[PDB]
Each structure stands twice: as C-alpha cells, then as structure tokens.
C-alpha cells in the first residue's frame, strides 16, 4: 500500500538552498516514474520535476530549470529535490507522487500522492 | 569540398551495427597530427593501456538540444566524459571503470544532429583543454576554431566526428582533481526551421574515449568498482 | 532451400505496432517522428522464433539450431525527412535497456539515402539450439535517439522497417509440424 | 608418498601475490585425463572463449567450518560456484560476467583448511556432477571417491586443489537452470584436537572457474550487469 | 644507494598494532590466532610514504617517484601453530574491501617452513609520481583467513611481520628536507 | 611556432558588426540577406595589426614584418539559403572603392558546398615592414553581391565568416610588449 | 567400462562394521585403537561379489570371471597417530586364521605418510569363473597388529579405509540384471 | 535521528515462515552492522543475527540457525528476516536493532532500537 513519506522543508532565505526527500513504500518503487509537484498559496498544482525509473531521464518545468535537480536512491527508495537559487516564487507546498503508465501507452497516472512539505522562501 | 565531402562523410562502425551518417560537417580531422605520441616522456612506455570493448563504444553521451533559438553566441559544457561518466551516464561497465590510475585519453567523438534539409545554422563545437571556463567573454567563442573542431549543418549533414587524442603535458593524469579534454560543442550561429524540415534537432553526444592508458595498477575489470579517491 | 524463405531477408512483426492498422501493414516500422527529446525510447520489441509470422511457421517446421539473426533496416525519408536512430538490435534476452543494449551487437546507421543497414543479432545461447517454446528467446530494442530533420516538409512522421536474416548457419534441424497445412 | 608428497604440495599464484600450500592432501588431479576437450560436437570451436583474470582469481569462497564434531558421515552443498556467484559472493566483476550464454566451466578449485600438527581427521571432497543430491542414504558417500578426490589431513597439510574440467556432456548449458559440477567438501572422518594444535577450522572454498566458454555474443564485458535470464 | 637501505626488504609499522604495546615492536607483525570463523576482518592498514617509520624518513628525502613496492610477509609459527592467511595487499586507494583486494595484486602463502611471501604492491596511479602530502597514498589490506591448526600447542597466537621493497625502480627523485638531521 | 597560433587560419573581428550583439559573436561574419539590389555596399572592413582581437596581441608582442594575409571565408547557408558576394579582400590601403578594390587581390566565390575561400591580402608596403601605430595599416572590403537564392525557406539571413592566415612568410620579428600578461 | 567403475580403486563396505554408525560411513574402515596387545584380531571380513554394495550391482549384471581383486588401503592417521597393521587380504575362502592368511597374498605396510598400500587378493578358484550364489566367495581378513604410537596426541582412534581393485582382467562376462534399474 | 520502523511480523500456524522488514533513518544504514533481537512471553532478550555492512557476514544463534535468513537492503535501507521453519519456541516480540564498534574496536554497541512486530507462532 503506497506511503509516500515527506521531509526537510523548511523555511529558508532567498538565494537559499534545500533538499526535500520523499520515501515511498508499498509498490515496486524502481519500476516507477516519479514526480515533484508543488501548490502555491493562492494558486493550484504545478508539476516540477519527473524521473524515469532507473534515474534516467528527468524533465523539469521551465521555471524550476537549471535552480532544481531530482535525483532518486533506488537502494533506499527514496526521491530528491535540490532546490538552489531559491526565489519566492517558489514558495508553496510539496507534495512527491508516483505515477505509472499503465500497460503499454505513454500517459503516466498518478496513484498516490504524499503529505506536502512546506517551502517558505521568504 | 565536395559535398558529400571526403574528409566528410564518414563512418564508424563496431558490434554490433554499422551506423552511417550523411556526413561530419567536417571533420574536426586530426591537423598536425600531434598526439603528442602515445608514448611520450613520460610513459616509459611502462603504461597500462586499454583498448577495450567498452571505451571505444561508445560515450554515447546525450546531448544539448538546440534550436533555431539560442545565439549567437552560446557555449558549451565539457563533456570530460570521464566525468560525465562519473557523475552521470557512467558507462555496469564503465562504473566498475571508474571503480583506477591516471588516464591516457583520447576521445574519440562523434556528435550526431538531424533535422532535415529544410534547417539550417551551424553549431561550431570545440576542443579546449582542461577549462578554465566562463562562458561570458565571447572573445573565447572567436578565440576557437584553433581547438579540435569538426562543425555541424542541418543543411548540410547527420553526423559529425570530432576526434581528440589528449591534452594535459603530463602525459597521464589524476581524475576526480583534472579536466583532460573538454569538448564544447557550440553554436556560432542557430538553426531556423521552416516546415520542410524535420522537427527536431535533438542533440547527442558520441565519444568514442579511445586509447586510454592507466598507471597503477588497481584492479579494473569491465565490472566497475573499485577503488579510484 | 528453406533458408533462402526464412532468410532472403525479411520483414519483419516485429512487435504490434500502435497502428493504424498500419501496424500490421507496417510491419517492419517503428514510427520515427519528431520528438521532445531524443534519447527517449520509443520501443521495445521481442523476437521469437514462435512470433512475427514470417519466424513462425519456419520455427515450428523445426526445433533446433543452426543460425544467426541478420536485422538490417530501411527507410522512407524523403529529402525533407530526415531521422537517426540507434537500434540495438538484441541478443538474446539480457539486460531490457538502454547502455547494456548499446554494449551489445551494434550498428551506427545515418538515415539518409543509404536506406540500409545491417544489424545482426545473433543467438548468444548457451546451447547450440534454443527449442520452441513459449517464455522468450529474447528482446530486440530500438531507440529512435535524433529525430528527422528537414524541409517545409514531408509529413512530419518517417518510418523504418526492419530486416530480418541468419547466417551463418543456414541450416537448421529436426522438422516439426509446419505451421501451414491440411488436414 | 613422500611427505611434502609430489603430487602433493603444490602452488597456485597469480596478482598479486604467491600463495604457498603446505600441499594438497592430494591433489584431486587428474586422472584419465577426459575433460571431454574443449572443443567437442559440440562447440564447432564456435564459443566464445574466456580465460579472463577475474574468473582465474578465484572464487575465493569461504568454506564450512568442520570440527572434531561432525561425522563420521556428512555431506556437502554443491558449490556450483557459478550458482553459488549468484546467489553470493557474487564476484563487481562477477556480478557484471554474471548479468550470459552457457558457459564452458572447469574448475579449478582450491581449498584451504589448517588447524596444526596437533589435528587430525580428514575431510573427503568429491566432485559428482549435477546434483540429485540428498544428504542421507550414506550409501552416496561410499560411491565416491570417483569424482575428483583431493583430500584434507589437519596432520598433514595446509592446503588442497581440487581440479574439475567440465561434466554435462551438452558441451555447454544454461545456468539458472542447471547445475554442473557440483564440488562436494565432505569429511570422512572428523578432525580432533588436542590441545597442540590451531584452535580453528575455519573452511575456505577457493575455486579457481577456468576456461569458461559462453556461447552468446551478448554483452559480457568485467562489470557486472546485463542481462541473463 | 639510499635504495638498498629504504629497499633493503624492510619491516614495517604498519598500522599503530594493537599493542602488547608489542605492536612497536611489531611492529611488521598483524596478529594470528584462532579464529571464530576465518573470514573475519581483522586488518586494514593504510600505506605512505609520510607514515611508518622508515617509510618517513626517505619519503621527506625526496618527493618523487621511482618504484614498486614490495610486502614480502614472515611467520612465525610453530610445528605447532600454523595459519594461513591472505594478504591484499593494496596498491593505491582503491576499492577498501574484500574482494576488490583480492582482485588486486595477489599472493596465496602456505605458512609452515616457507616462511616468506612476496606481495608486491606497484603503484598503479595517474602520474609516475606521487608527492608528499597528508591525504593517503592508499591502503594496503591483510586477511587473516584461516588460523592455526595445530598440536597442543604453542601459545595459540602466532604472528607475522610484514616485509617491504621496491623495484622496479630504485632510483627516485628531488631530494627534500631529510627526516634526520641538525640544526 | 607563434606563427601558427596566428596563423592557423584564424577568424576574425573585423569589424564592430551591427550586432545582435552577434557581431562579438560573429565575429568573422559579415550579414546576408536579400537585397533590394545586389550590387550595394554593405561592407567596409579596416583591418590592423593592432585592432581585432587575435592580431592584436600579436601585433603588440612584435612590431615588424615577416608575411602576407589570408583572409579565407566559410558559409553557413543552407540547400536553401544560398549566397555570392566578392571580397576584395584588400591590401594596404588604398582606393577604398568598388573597381579598385575588384582590381585588387581577387577571388571569386560560389557559396554552396564548397564552404570556403581564399582570399589573401598581401602587405603590398613600401618596406618589408610597418610598425605598430595607430592610423591604419589598411582595409579590407567585401561586397555582397547577388543574395542568397533559395527555398521556402531558411531564415532569410545567411552569414558569413572570414578567415585570416599570412604566409608566406611565416616569421616575424621584434618582440615587444605581448598583450597577454602580468604584472 | 564397467571396468573402471568397478575398477577405478573403490572403497569398500566390508563388512557391517561397529558403526557408530559410522561403519556405513566408513565403510572402507576397520577401527585402529590402542590395544592390550597386539596381536589380538579384531576383523574378519567376507567378500563377495554380491554383498558390499559397489560390488553388489557389477556382480549382478555379470556372472562370470574376468579379474583379479586388490585391495589397497590408506589411512587417517596425524603426525600423532599412527599404527601398522597386516592385512591379509584374502583369497578365496580358505584358511581364516592367522598363518595361513599371513601365508596369503601380502602386504606390509607401515602406516606414516605412504597413505597407500597394494593388497590384492586373487581369485584362486579351481574355475575360471564363480557364478553368483549364496554361500561364499572367501574371506578377507584384517589384523590390526600393533596400534598406534604417539603424541598428547590425537584421538586415539585411528581408521583405515580400504580400496579394492582387479585387473588383471578387468573384462568380465555374461550380462544379467543389474542391480539398478527400472521396472 | 535513528527511526527503525518494523513490520510484517503475525500471528503463524506452527511449520510456517514470516519475513520481517525493519527500515531505518537518520544514520548512514550502509556503514553500521545490524542485528534482530527477539524477547518471549516470559523471557529476557535473546540476540537472534546481525549482518554486516555490506550484507557480507552474518551470524546466527544456534536456535535461530538454518530457519531463520537475514538480508539487508541497502538500496533501500531496509533489514529482513526470513524465518522458516516456526516452532512456538519462536514467540516474541522481535525488534531490529542497529549496532557501532565506535572507532577501532571490536564491540559493537546497540544505540538505537525499533519499536518491536510480534510474531505468535501458535
């Protein structure tokens, strides 16, 4: 059953650096695709960032670009957020989610969402 | 030249397919041919080289996708490739590689590109070595062609062969400190696409790291793991 | 002899196809179109003996070895289309992926008016013969990396099939019942 | 024979050391002489062919601790050394051979074992091929001897190679589902100490897997993965 | 030359030797008793130039290379005790490990009356020299294996010194600021 | 040699290129696009020593003569973009004009796949050599001619890039204050 | 051949053995212990064909002769034991005893690092060929004479496991059911 | 900050096998050996395994021997326990446990442990 577990965010200074990570278990974590999403106060869901399986290749949203890296551990199943050059726009809460494309199409579905993690850049 | 060129086209071929281009731009073709020697002062000749399945393989790197958009007027990473692999790509392998002694490298590149006739910009990749790099200061962008470079035409070409055989006087060198060859792979000018063109220019990155000799010596296995800081 | 049939190169399933139904059509085609990025696998496609009709009768009018696999592709670019894959073009049933596929059998192609190519997969089996049954012999995959690049244009999407043939043996062994006939 | 014996004592070396017996029991050697070839029908001399350091270095397995107490009347496992690879000790260079075609395997096997002058009981070996294999019906034990015997004697020795060429007539075969030589370190008689001796058998398994013929092309490179079953 | 006496095949501290404090004195000697089981690790010593003893003094003499460096082990057993072990042992700063090490350099010892080894580390690292700094040059990793089989016996443990050389090279190079002096 | 350096065939300012700014960028480019009419000016390049990047740290590190200057041009145009100018490409100083400057060294280039030229401006000096000074060794003219013919098609602009090398001579002489340096 | 198997030096029951039970086990194994003195016998052994089970399965697929029978015996002593007896080893069926055994075929072995000893009976039978019945081929007998001698040492017992063989004819005659098998 | 989190562990018929998971936090997993202690109904502690590091060595108790399997996933930090074989005398709570030889010694100090999985073989 799908627990996907959320830390380290915290409040921090613009220019600031974090590390969010997000656990999962319940589901074989290594065949999965996984994603960043975040909401904003006063605003809806933005997808960040996905990583594809064996942390091959990852997208990221023009906004987050060259700021953000996601990186998975596999041996501890578990998924990354580095968060450089940290702006206020960036502000919002965090929620890790795994998605899975089904039989053999190329739509990948989210399944289960974490808790949120919140990311006060100010 | 004659287009199609000689010095062109090309070809490289290994297990377990034959991959033909259209043709390397050109070539960044091997110039006063100075290696500085394979064996130099400095390997007494003593060395432990390779020549191995997987280097020449392929880096078999991705690369940078450019578009008609970015100008001019652009760098390039490095793509050390051995610290492309390390950090990324790590080519089971190249991770038990990665897992030895200062390294003899040259390249050996291939940078493939592909959208149609319809496109047209080059993109001037270049060989500097060990970086010290900045990409402001566009005197660096005029400074080079001197460095290994091959070039790139939608217009006129898929596949482009950049060749470099090793930098760095010390004949052999520390990894995880130095930076041997950096080949950047720029554009002077960009790409436009019209619509009789294809839509994509997708970049990848081939090297092929060819002829690297290592000094100590460790255990390297094609498994990768060991033992390198 | 038989092996001319099996063997005069063929074409292939490969794979069904996310058709048209020009997948059956097809079959010897992935599609090669363009693409967000170019690394990303598009394909996936297991060889058997059994399976892709071509491969299935001859296998089933026999239960041994003796072969190669020969997958030599082509390619409906146009001036305007053009494309560059890499396939892999598998044996025998490792590692599912990316770089393992790339450390195997190997063939660097240009997809522009050459419209061949060879790569040959041959069976790495530790026996001789592999016998007919249902698991799998093992994957070939294909990555299209580079898309096509080009014109105005041709419209967008390009398409390959692929080839089939073993050397070098061409000669097999045991016959069994051959996939067509009467009774 | 004579102690210290010929056959007996024994050497193995390779990177990077010497290591020195006081000899093997004896030797489990060989006999009339039917490895069957290494070419047969079979491999067409087609196969692909190893010989390759790691699989030389050894299997460098541990082996079961046998004491005063077990008796008399014992078996044990098979030590497929292949299977046991996969399953464990796995030799990063293993783990990147293991993840290919069916393999051509001879042994070659060493087996270390030293309590002191003071013990005494030896450890009968054997090497029966596939393994049927079930522990009672002793009946087993006395059938070998036919399969390669080397022998331990606590009172005299430090030391024992057991080598094994290859059995399963099929000239090469599929792993995860069969199992050739399968290397039985058994006692006979139990070793006992008294009190001038090493308090300590302590078993080591060393396998020396020589020769390894595989017969698909695949990916095998001295890393570790790929693609198998 | 300066080599035979850095050369002339030394003894080692290695490791500061979990001491009687017998393990100055030692200093050569890892210790050899019976064991639980005989995998266990006991051992890991680092290696250079700076550090133990004799090392020290010739590695501040010069600060280049040429050379090998040669451990050859020596026991001291009994009839009565025995042993076995082996030894890495380590060139240059690798994997730390099991068998890593035992992929490396290698030597397999008997020890009863041989009572000699040679286990040569080479320096297998990026430049022909390496300087003297304070990080590591690398580790060098024994393992005791098997213990002692035995007799009666002997007072159980039973220990070995460590023996240390280079080749090839003798000869190095930069002279530097001697460990003995005056002022 | 420093020659080489120089010398192998470099790319050039020329100008300060109305940039994008991809005259930095360019430099070597002038611009090509279609013209209201083919034969009009756009170009007038001044070439020294001094001035332009690479000559200039040259130029400061001697102050006389050993050569003669090649200016070679490359072309990115396309199957569709095509092109033809003339370039003077002229030496020292003279009419800076139309017939003159065609009177002048010569070359003429196509621009399709040939993607290079040679024109070489001699220093046709009163003596073998000038010094470095600051009114102007000369200038180089290029002249668009005819655009760019074409397609559908490429976006519009085509440009160009110049190259510069000296023979024959090779060698200079007197060496001064070299641009690059410390203090 | 057959031969081999039979041949290839086997071990045998002997007898049933006060087993531990180690007397399956053993089989090959009479006990060497100290003695009161050491002469006394302990052991007696029968052999047939049938009975002991190698030999069991030969002799019933064949029932006649060609051969000889060795027994050769080695031993587990330690430096610390050691021991010296004689065996018989004895043909057919005579005298069971003392003298007219040691009159026998012989051997004298002295139990130290040899390991190995040649006692090979023959079949001395008014016919070339004994046939598979019942009541006896012969007798084999073992005398432990004198035990072992010492140490501090070992304990005490000693065992020995026997080995048996024939030539000259390893050829034997007329197929009949062999012990293993299916039904 | 240490969290071992252990489940898995049920109620068993006699003749049965469980596997107990116990996964980890806050501590480089990979570095520290580990070990499964159990505690009976009536009973005092009872060391069962450890493993070691690498999941290269590993020890048993005499009862627990060739029943019971230890494994560590270090991907994904994470300790198993395959116990076959269950006889009754097998009752506990069972706890996993995470143990340091400090610097160059050979004890090995439990410092943290998991909150204990119950297992009635009955």
């Known amino acids: 059953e799908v627990q996907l577990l959320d830390s380290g965010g915290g409040l921090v200074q613009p220019g600031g650096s974090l590390r969010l990570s997000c656990?999962?278990?319940?589901?074989?974590?290594?065949?999965?695709?996984?994603?960043?999403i975040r909401q904003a106060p006063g605003k809806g869901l933005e997808w960040?960032?996905?990583?594809?399986?064996?942390?091959?290749?990852?997208?990221?949203?023009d906004s987050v670009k060259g700021r953000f890296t996601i990186s998975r551990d596999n041996s501890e199943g578990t998924v990354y957020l580095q968060m450089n050059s940290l702006s206020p726009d960036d502000t919002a809460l965090?929620?890790?989610?795994?998605?899975?494309?089904?039989?053999?199409?190329?739509?990948?579905?989210?399944?289960?969402?974490?808790?949120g993690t919140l990311v006060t850049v100010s | 030249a004659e287009p199609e060129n000689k010095n062109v086209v090309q070809a490289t071929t290994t297990v377990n397919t034959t991959n033909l281009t259209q043709h390397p731009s050109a070539p960044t073709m091997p110039f006063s041919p100075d290696f500085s020697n394979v064996d130099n002062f400095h390997s007494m000749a003593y060395d432990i080289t390779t020549g191995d399945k997987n280097p020449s393989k392929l880096v078999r790197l991705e690369t940078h996708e450019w578009t008609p958009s970015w100008a001019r007027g652009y760098q390039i990473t490095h793509v050390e490739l051995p610290k492309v692999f390390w950090d990324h790509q790590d080519k089971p392998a190249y991770g038990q590689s990665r897992y030895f002694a200062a390294v003899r490298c040259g390249f050996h590149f291939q940078v493939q590109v592909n959208v149609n006739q319809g496109t047209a910009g080059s993109a001037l990749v270049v060989y500097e070595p060990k970086p010290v790099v900045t990409y402001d200061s566009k005197l660096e962008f005029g400074a080079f062609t001197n460095l290994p470079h091959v070039l790139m035409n939608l217009a006129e070409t898929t596949q482009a062969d950049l060749c470099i055989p090793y930098v760095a006087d010390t004949n052999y060198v520390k990894t995880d400190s130095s930076d041997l060859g950096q080949l950047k792979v720029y554009v002077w000018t960009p790409l436009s696409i019209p619509t009789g063109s294809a839509n994509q220019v997708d970049v990848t990155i081939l090297g092929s790291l060819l002829q690297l000799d290592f000094q100590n010596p460790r255990v390297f296995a094609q498994d990768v793991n060991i033992y390198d800081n | 002899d038989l092996v001319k049939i099996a063997q005069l190169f063929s074409v292939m399933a490969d794979s069904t196809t996310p058709s048209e139904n020009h997948g059956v059509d097809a079959k010897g085609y992935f599609k090669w179109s363009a693409t967000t990025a170019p690394q990303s696998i598009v394909h996936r496609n297991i060889v058997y003996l059994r399976l892709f009709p071509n491969l299935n009768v001859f296998v089933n009018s026999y239960s041994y070895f003796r072969g190669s696999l020969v997958l030599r592709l082509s390619v409906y670019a146009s001036t305007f289309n053009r494309g560059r894959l890499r396939m892999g073009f598998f044996p025998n049933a490792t590692t599912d992926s990316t770089s393992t596929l790339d450390n195997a059998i190997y063939t660097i192609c240009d997809i522009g008016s050459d419209n061949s190519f060879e790569i040959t997969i041959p069976y790495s089996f530790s026996t001789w013969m592999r016998k007919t049954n249902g698991h799998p012999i093992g994957l070939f995959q294909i990555e299209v990396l580079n898309r096509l690049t080009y014109n105005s244009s041709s419209p967008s999407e390009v398409y390959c099939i692929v080839q089939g043939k073993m050397g070098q043996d061409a000669r097999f062994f045991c016959p069994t019942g051959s996939v067509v006939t009467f009774q | 024979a004579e102690p210290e014996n010929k056959n007996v004592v024994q050497a193995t070396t390779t990177v990077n050391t010497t290591n020195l017996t006081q000899h093997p029991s004896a030797p489990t050697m060989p006999f009339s002489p039917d490895f069957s070839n290494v070419d047969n029908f079979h491999s067409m001399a087609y196969d692909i062919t190893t010989g390759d350091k790691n699989p030389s270095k050894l299997v460098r397995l541990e082996t079961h601790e046998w004491t005063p107490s077990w008796a008399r009347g014992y078996q044990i496992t098979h030590v497929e050394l292949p299977k046991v690879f996969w399953d464990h000790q796995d030799k990063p260079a293993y783990g990147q051979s293991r993840y290919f075609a069916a393999v051509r395997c001879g042994f070659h096997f060493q087996v270390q074992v030293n309590v002191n002058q003071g013990t005494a009981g030896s450890a009968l070996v054997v090497y029966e091929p596939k393994p049927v294999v079930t522990y009672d019906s002793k009946l087993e034990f006395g059938a070998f001897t036919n399969l390669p015997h080397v022998l331990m004697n606590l009172a005299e020795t430090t030391q024992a190679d057991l080598c094994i060429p290859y059995v399963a007539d099929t000239n090469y075969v599929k792993t995860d589902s069969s199992d050739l030589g399968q290397l039985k370190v058994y006692v006979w008689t139990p070793l006992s100490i008294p009190t001038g001796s090493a308090n300590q058998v302590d078993v080591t398994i060393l396998g020396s897997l020589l020769q390894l013929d595989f017969q698909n092309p695949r990916v095998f490179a001295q890393d570790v993965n790929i693609y198998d079953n | 030359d300066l080599v035979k006496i850095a050369q002339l095949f030394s003894v080692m501290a290695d490791s500061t030797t979990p001491s009687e404090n017998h393990g100055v004195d030692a200093k050569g000697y890892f210790k050899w008793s019976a064991t639980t089981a005989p995998q266990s690790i006991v051992h890991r010593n680092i290696v250079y130039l700076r550090l133990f003893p004799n090392l020290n003094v010739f590695v501040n003499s010069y600060s280049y290379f040429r050379g090998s460096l040669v451990l050859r082990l020596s026991v001291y057993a009994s009839t009565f005790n025995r042993g076995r072990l082996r030894m890495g042992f380590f060139p240059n700063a690798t994997t730390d490990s099991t068998s890593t090490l035992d992929n490396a350099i290698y030597t397999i010892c008997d020890i009863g009356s041989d009572n000699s080894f040679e286990i040569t580390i080479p320096y297998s690292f990026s430049t022909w020299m390496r300087k003297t700094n304070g990080h590591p040059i690398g580790l060098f990793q024994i393992e005791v294996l098997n213990r002692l089989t035995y007799n009666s016996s002997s007072p159980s443990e039973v220990y070995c010194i460590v023996q240390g050389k280079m080749g090839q090279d003798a000869r190095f190079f930069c002279p530097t600021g001697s460990v003995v002096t005056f002022q | 040699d420093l020659v080489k350096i120089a010398q192998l065939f470099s790319v050039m300012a020329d100008s300060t290129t109305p940039s994008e700014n991809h005259g930095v960028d360019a430099k070597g480019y002038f611009k090509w696009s279609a013209t209201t009419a083919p034969q009009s000016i756009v170009h007038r390049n001044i070439v020294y020593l001094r001035l332009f990047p690479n000559l200039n740290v040259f130029v400061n590190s001697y102050s006389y003569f050993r050569g003669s200057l090649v200016l070679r041009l490359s072309v990115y145009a396309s199957t569709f973009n095509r092109g033809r100018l003339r370039m003077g490409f002229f030496p020292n100083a003279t009419t800076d004009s139309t017939s003159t400057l065609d009177n002048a060294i010569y070359t003429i280039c196509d621009i399709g796949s040939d993607n290079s030229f040679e024109i070489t401006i001699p220093y046709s000096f009163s003596t073998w050599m000038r010094k470095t000074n600051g009114h102007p060794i000369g200038l180089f003219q290029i002249e668009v001619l005819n655009r760019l013919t074409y397609n559908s098609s490429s976006p519009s602009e085509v440009y160009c890039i110049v190259q510069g090398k000296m023979g024959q001579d090779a060698r200079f002489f007197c060496p001064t204050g070299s641009v690059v340096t410390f203090q | 051949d057959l031969v081999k198997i039979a041949q290839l030096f086997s071990v045998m029951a002997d007898s049933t053995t006060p087993s531990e039970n180690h007397g399956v086990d053993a089989k090959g194994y009479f006990k060497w212990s100290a003695t009161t003195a050491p002469q006394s016998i302990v052991h007696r052994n029968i052999v047939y064909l049938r009975l002991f089970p190698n030999l069991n399965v030969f002799v019933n697929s064949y029932s006649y002769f060609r051969g000889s029978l060795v027994l050769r015996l080695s031993v587990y002593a330690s430096t610390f034991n050691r021991g010296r007896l004689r065996m018989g080893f004895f043909p057919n069926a005579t005298t069971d005893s003392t003298s007219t055994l040691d009159n026998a075929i012989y051997t004298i072995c002295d139990i130290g690092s040899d390991n190995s000893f040649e006692i090979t009976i023959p079949y001395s039978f008014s016919t070339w060929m004994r046939k598979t019945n019942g009541h006896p081929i012969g007798l084999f007998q073992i005398e432990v004479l004198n035990r072992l001698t010492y140490n501090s040492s070992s304990p005490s017992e000693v065992y020995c496991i026997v080995q048996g063989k024939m030539g000259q004819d390893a050829r034997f005659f007329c197929p009949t059911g062999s012990v293993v098998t299916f039904q | 900050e240490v969290q071992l989190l252990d489940s898995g562990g049920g109620l068993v018929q006699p003749g049965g096998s469980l596997r107990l998971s116990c996964a980890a936090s806050?501590?480089?997993?990979?570095?520290?050996?580990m070990s499964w202690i159990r505690q009976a109904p009536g009973k005092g502690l009872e060391w069962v395994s450890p493993?070691?590091?690498?999941?290269?060595?590993?020890y048993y108790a005499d009862s627990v021997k060739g029943r019971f399997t230890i494994s560590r996933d270090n991907s994904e930090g994470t300790v198993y326990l395959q116990m076959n074989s269950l006889s009754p005398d097998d009752t506990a709570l069972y706890y996993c446990?995470?143990?340091?030889?400090?610097?160059?010694?050979?004890?090995?100090?439990?410092?943290?442990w998991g909150q204990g999985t119950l297992v009635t073989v009955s």
């Open positions: 806050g501590f480089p997993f990979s570095d520290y050996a």
């Open positions: 446990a995470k143990d340091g030889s400090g610097s160059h010694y050979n004890n090995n100090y439990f410092d943290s």
């Open positions: 493993i070691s590091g690498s999941g290269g060595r590993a």
